Amino acid sequence: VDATMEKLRAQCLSRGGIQGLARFFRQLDRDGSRSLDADEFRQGLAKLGLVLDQAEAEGVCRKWDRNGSGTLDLEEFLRALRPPMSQAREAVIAAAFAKLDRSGDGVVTVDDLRGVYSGEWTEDEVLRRFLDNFDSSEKDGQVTLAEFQDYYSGVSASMNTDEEFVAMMTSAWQL
Protein backbone atom coordinates (compact mmCIF):
# COMPACT_ATOMS: atom_id res chain seq x y z
CA VAL A 1 0.00 0.00 0.00
CA ASP A 2 2.85 2.38 0.90
CA ALA A 3 4.76 0.80 -1.96
CA THR A 4 1.85 1.63 -4.25
CA MET A 5 1.82 5.13 -2.75
CA GLU A 6 5.55 5.43 -3.53
CA LYS A 7 5.18 4.15 -7.12
CA LEU A 8 2.74 7.03 -7.65
CA ARG A 9 5.36 9.65 -6.80
CA ALA A 10 8.10 7.82 -8.72
CA GLN A 11 5.63 8.16 -11.57
CA CYS A 12 4.81 11.79 -10.78
CA LEU A 13 8.56 12.45 -10.78
CA SER A 14 8.36 11.83 -14.54
CA ARG A 15 7.76 15.60 -15.01
CA GLY A 16 5.05 16.44 -12.41
CA GLY A 17 6.79 19.23 -9.39
CA ILE A 18 4.04 20.41 -7.03
CA GLN A 19 2.28 22.88 -9.31
CA GLY A 20 1.93 19.83 -11.54
CA LEU A 21 0.32 17.95 -8.65
CA ALA A 22 -2.60 20.45 -8.64
CA ARG A 23 -2.89 19.84 -12.37
CA PHE A 24 -3.04 16.08 -11.78
CA PHE A 25 -5.34 16.58 -8.75
CA ARG A 26 -7.91 18.23 -10.97
CA GLN A 27 -7.68 15.46 -13.58
CA LEU A 28 -8.38 12.96 -10.77
CA ASP A 29 -11.39 14.98 -9.67
CA ARG A 30 -13.84 13.72 -12.33
CA ASP A 31 -16.90 15.54 -10.95
CA GLY A 32 -14.88 18.69 -10.30
CA SER A 33 -16.16 18.72 -6.73
CA ARG A 34 -12.73 20.08 -5.70
CA SER A 35 -12.08 17.00 -3.54
CA LEU A 36 -11.24 13.33 -4.06
CA ASP A 37 -13.36 10.44 -2.86
CA ALA A 38 -11.94 6.98 -2.31
CA ASP A 39 -13.72 5.98 -5.52
CA GLU A 40 -12.27 8.77 -7.73
CA PHE A 41 -8.85 8.14 -6.21
CA ARG A 42 -8.99 4.43 -7.08
CA GLN A 43 -10.09 4.75 -10.74
CA GLY A 44 -7.42 7.38 -11.28
CA LEU A 45 -4.64 5.12 -10.06
CA ALA A 46 -6.04 2.25 -12.12
CA LYS A 47 -5.47 4.47 -15.17
CA LEU A 48 -1.77 4.41 -14.18
CA GLY A 49 -1.35 0.66 -13.63
CA LEU A 50 -1.49 1.04 -9.86
CA VAL A 51 -4.15 -1.20 -8.32
CA LEU A 52 -5.79 -1.14 -4.92
CA ASP A 53 -9.34 -2.08 -3.86
CA GLN A 54 -12.00 0.22 -2.35
CA ALA A 55 -11.10 -0.64 1.27
CA GLU A 56 -7.49 0.18 0.46
CA ALA A 57 -8.59 3.49 -1.15
CA GLU A 58 -10.72 4.59 1.83
CA GLY A 59 -7.68 3.63 3.91
CA VAL A 60 -5.36 5.97 1.99
CA CYS A 61 -7.98 8.74 2.11
CA ARG A 62 -8.38 8.04 5.84
CA LYS A 63 -4.63 8.53 6.44
CA TRP A 64 -4.33 11.89 4.67
CA ASP A 65 -7.80 13.28 5.40
CA ARG A 66 -6.64 15.77 8.01
CA ASN A 67 -10.09 17.27 8.70
CA GLY A 68 -12.25 14.13 8.72
CA SER A 69 -14.27 15.09 5.64
CA GLY A 70 -13.99 11.54 4.33
CA THR A 71 -12.42 13.20 1.29
CA LEU A 72 -9.09 14.57 0.03
CA ASP A 73 -8.89 18.29 -0.79
CA LEU A 74 -6.08 20.02 -2.69
CA GLU A 75 -4.03 20.68 0.44
CA GLU A 76 -4.26 17.12 1.77
CA PHE A 77 -3.51 15.71 -1.70
CA LEU A 78 -0.44 17.90 -1.98
CA ARG A 79 0.73 16.72 1.43
CA ALA A 80 0.08 13.13 0.33
CA LEU A 81 2.38 13.39 -2.69
CA ARG A 82 5.18 15.40 -1.03
CA PRO A 83 8.35 13.30 -1.36
CA PRO A 84 8.88 12.00 2.20
CA MET A 85 11.99 13.41 3.94
CA SER A 86 15.17 11.31 4.16
CA GLN A 87 15.54 9.25 7.33
CA ALA A 88 18.48 11.27 8.74
CA ARG A 89 16.45 14.45 8.58
CA GLU A 90 13.55 12.58 10.05
CA ALA A 91 15.69 11.16 12.86
CA VAL A 92 16.98 14.57 14.09
CA ILE A 93 13.37 15.85 14.18
CA ALA A 94 12.36 12.68 16.04
CA ALA A 95 15.27 13.31 18.36
CA ALA A 96 14.32 16.93 18.95
CA PHE A 97 10.69 15.91 19.54
CA ALA A 98 11.73 13.58 22.35
CA LYS A 99 13.58 16.47 23.96
CA LEU A 100 10.66 18.79 23.64
CA ASP A 101 8.23 16.17 24.95
CA ARG A 102 9.51 16.03 28.60
CA SER A 103 6.49 13.89 29.70
CA GLY A 104 7.15 11.54 26.78
CA ASP A 105 3.53 10.53 26.25
CA GLY A 106 3.75 11.24 22.50
CA VAL A 107 2.52 14.83 22.25
CA VAL A 108 3.91 18.21 23.33
CA THR A 109 1.70 20.35 25.57
CA VAL A 110 1.89 23.58 27.62
CA ASP A 111 2.88 21.33 30.55
CA ASP A 112 5.90 19.90 28.73
CA LEU A 113 7.17 23.46 28.32
CA ARG A 114 6.98 24.18 32.05
CA GLY A 115 10.41 24.66 33.65
CA VAL A 116 12.14 24.74 30.26
CA TYR A 117 10.81 28.02 28.91
CA SER A 118 9.22 31.19 30.35
CA GLY A 119 -0.44 42.51 34.48
CA GLU A 120 -1.64 41.38 31.10
CA TRP A 121 -0.50 38.15 29.47
CA THR A 122 0.01 35.52 32.20
CA GLU A 123 2.52 32.72 32.70
CA ASP A 124 1.25 29.81 30.55
CA GLU A 125 -0.73 32.08 28.25
CA VAL A 126 2.78 33.01 27.06
CA LEU A 127 3.72 29.30 27.17
CA ARG A 128 0.61 28.61 25.06
CA ARG A 129 1.76 31.14 22.47
CA PHE A 130 5.02 29.23 22.20
CA LEU A 131 3.26 25.85 21.75
CA ASP A 132 1.20 27.57 19.02
CA ASN A 133 4.26 28.41 16.95
CA PHE A 134 4.87 24.71 16.19
CA ASP A 135 1.18 23.75 16.05
CA SER A 136 -0.98 23.58 12.97
CA SER A 137 -2.94 26.62 11.78
CA GLU A 138 -5.84 25.61 14.08
CA LYS A 139 -4.27 25.67 17.54
CA ASP A 140 -5.66 22.94 19.86
CA GLY A 141 -2.97 22.92 22.59
CA GLN A 142 -1.23 19.78 21.35
CA VAL A 143 1.72 19.30 19.03
CA THR A 144 2.09 15.94 17.37
CA LEU A 145 5.24 14.52 15.78
CA ALA A 146 3.60 14.93 12.36
CA GLU A 147 2.88 18.55 13.22
CA PHE A 148 6.39 19.23 14.46
CA GLN A 149 7.61 17.60 11.26
CA ASP A 150 5.57 20.01 9.12
CA TYR A 151 7.00 22.95 11.02
CA TYR A 152 10.36 22.14 9.44
CA SER A 153 9.17 20.98 6.03
CA GLY A 154 9.94 24.52 4.85
CA VAL A 155 13.57 24.88 5.89
CA SER A 156 14.25 21.21 5.08
CA ALA A 157 13.02 21.73 1.53
CA SER A 158 15.27 24.80 1.30
CA MET A 159 18.37 23.04 2.66
CA ASN A 160 19.91 20.83 -0.06
CA THR A 161 21.82 18.34 2.21
CA ASP A 162 21.00 16.15 5.25
CA GLU A 163 24.07 17.51 7.04
CA GLU A 164 22.97 21.09 6.72
CA PHE A 165 19.63 20.07 8.25
CA VAL A 166 21.22 17.78 10.83
CA ALA A 167 23.74 20.47 11.92
CA MET A 168 21.05 23.16 12.26
CA MET A 169 18.66 20.99 14.29
CA THR A 170 21.52 19.80 16.50
CA SER A 171 22.38 23.40 17.47
CA ALA A 172 18.80 24.75 17.79
CA TRP A 173 17.84 22.02 20.24
CA GLN A 174 21.32 21.31 21.69
CA LEU A 175 21.08 17.57 20.98
Please pick, from the candidates 6, 105, 125, 163, the single residue that binds Ca ion as defined by CB under 5 A: 105
Asked if 159 touches a second copy (CB under 8 A), the answer is: no
Between 77 and 166, CB nearer to Ca ion = 77
Q: What distances in angstroms separate CA 151 from CA 18, 43, 133, one per listed residue? A: 18, 33, 9
Which one-letter DSSP state was computed for residue 36? B
Please pick, from the candidates 43, 69, 87, 153, the single residue that binds Ca ion as defined by CB under 5 A: 69
Q: CA 9, CA 3: separation in Å to the nearest integer?
A: 10
Between 70 and 106, CB nearer to a second copy = 106
Q: Is 73 annotated as a binding residue?
A: no
CB of 117 to a second copy, least distance (A): 9
Which one-letter DSSP state was computed for residue 70? S
Show the site string, 88-127: x = touches a second copy by CB under 8 A, - = not. Answer: x--x--xx-xx--x--xxxx----------x---------
| CB contact at 8 A, 42 and 54 | yes
CB of 84 to a second copy, least distance (A): 13
Reference 93, options 24, 11, 29, 162; nearest CA is: 162
Residue 98: contacted member of a second copy, Ca ion, none (CB under 5 to 8 Å, by partner type): a second copy
Q: Is 111 annotated as a binding residue?
A: no
Helix axis angle, 2-12 to 74-81, nearest 10°: 90
Q: How would you class 49 by CB atoms within 10 Å of its CB: exposed for 0-12, middle for 13-18, buried for 19 or more?
A: exposed
Determine the 3-state secondary structure of 21 from DSSP: helix
Interface residues with a second copy (CB under 8 A) are 63, 87-88, 91, 94-95, 97-98, 101, 104-107, 118, 144-146, 162, 171-172, 174
Q: Which residues are annotated as a binding site for Ca(2+)?
A: 29, 31, 33, 35, 40, 65, 67, 69, 71, 76, 101, 103, 105, 112
